Amino acid sequence: PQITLWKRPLVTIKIGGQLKEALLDTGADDTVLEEMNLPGRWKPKMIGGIGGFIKVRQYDQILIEICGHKAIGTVLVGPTPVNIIGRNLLTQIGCTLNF
Amino acid sequence: PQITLWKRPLVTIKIGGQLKEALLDTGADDTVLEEMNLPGRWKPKMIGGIGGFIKVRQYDQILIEICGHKAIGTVLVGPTPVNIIGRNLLTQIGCTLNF
Numbered sequence: 001p002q003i004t005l006w007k008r009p010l011v012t013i014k015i016g017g018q019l020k021e022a023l024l025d026t027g028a029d030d031t032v033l034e035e036m037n038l039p040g041r042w043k044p045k046m047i048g049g050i051g052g053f054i055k056v057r058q059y060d061q062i063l064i065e066i067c068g069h070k071a072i073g074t075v076l077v078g079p080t081p082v083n084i085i086g087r088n089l090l091t092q093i094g095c096t097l098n099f
Numbered sequence: 100p101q102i103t104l105w106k107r108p109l110v111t112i113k114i115g116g117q118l119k120e121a122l123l124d125t126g127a128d129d130t131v132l133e134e135m136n137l138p139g140r141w142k143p144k145m146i147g148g149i150g151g152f153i154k155v156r157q158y159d160q161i162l163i164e165i166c167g168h169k170a171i172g173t174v175l176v177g178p179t180p181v182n183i184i185g186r187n188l189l190t191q192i193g194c195t196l197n198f
């Protein structure tokens with residue numbers, strides 16, 4: 001598909017058996033999801049953006065389905081205001097910017 | 100062009116007659132550039148990100164050239180960690196997401 005940018009590029013994702021709405025974000029290196037208690041090991045991390053840093057839990061090799069396209073990678077979980085799909089997963093679904 | 104996301108989508112921009120590097124950021128509503136001197140009126144504004152809010156200077160109807168494509172729109176200037184081109188200007192240059 002093609003997604004115009006008049007509105008936020010929000011799409012449905014499937015993760016850890018749950019459906020959620022997330023932002024396709026070319027400005028995020030990594031994927032940051034709202035608080036959810038996913039099973040398995042995790043490592044503490046701090047990620048910074050506008051306004052400073054927040055503490056997140058880094059889970060590795062997490063599967064996520066993004067509009068029917070599967071991707072497997074690192075997911076950071078924490079008090080993010082929005083579910084953010086970053087480049088680590090956008091690359092796997094073949095997403096590009098075009099103008 | 101078509102820009103893949105294996106690397107950060109950084110491009111050269113031209114603003115106020117100066118060249119800079121900026122990130123094409125589909126997760127940003129607005130365009131926020133690091134501290135710099137622009138001519139003309141500006142108004143104080145606040146914008147929020149992953150880590151909280153920052154104070155910026157809002158410059159309206161600013162000419163900016165992004166990877167060779169012209170835009171005239173709002174530019175916020177302030178303590179952003181990196182220059183980000185948001186949707187307000189990405190739409191003007193005809194940028195879309197595709198997978």
Ligand SMILES: CCOP(=O)(COc1ccc(C[C@H](NC(=O)O[C@H]2CO[C@H]3OCC[C@H]32)[C@H](O)CN(C[C@@H](C)CC)S(=O)(=O)c2ccc(CO)cc2)cc1)OCC
Nearest residue numbers: 027028029030047048049050081126127128129147148149
């Ligand atoms: C708390 C109240 O904030 P809030 O609810 C908004 O919440 C939001 C918070 C974040 C975003 C996404 C970010 N966009 C953003 O900063 O945009 C600003 C300017 O345009 C406005 O539009 C939306 C916000 C304003 C950006 O795409 C991605 N970032 C990196 C860039 C900064 C490059 C360093 S990152 O997320 O920091 C980040 C860092 C590290 C990792 C791990 O690799 C992953 C993600 C969108 C909405 O309301 C406020 C309007």
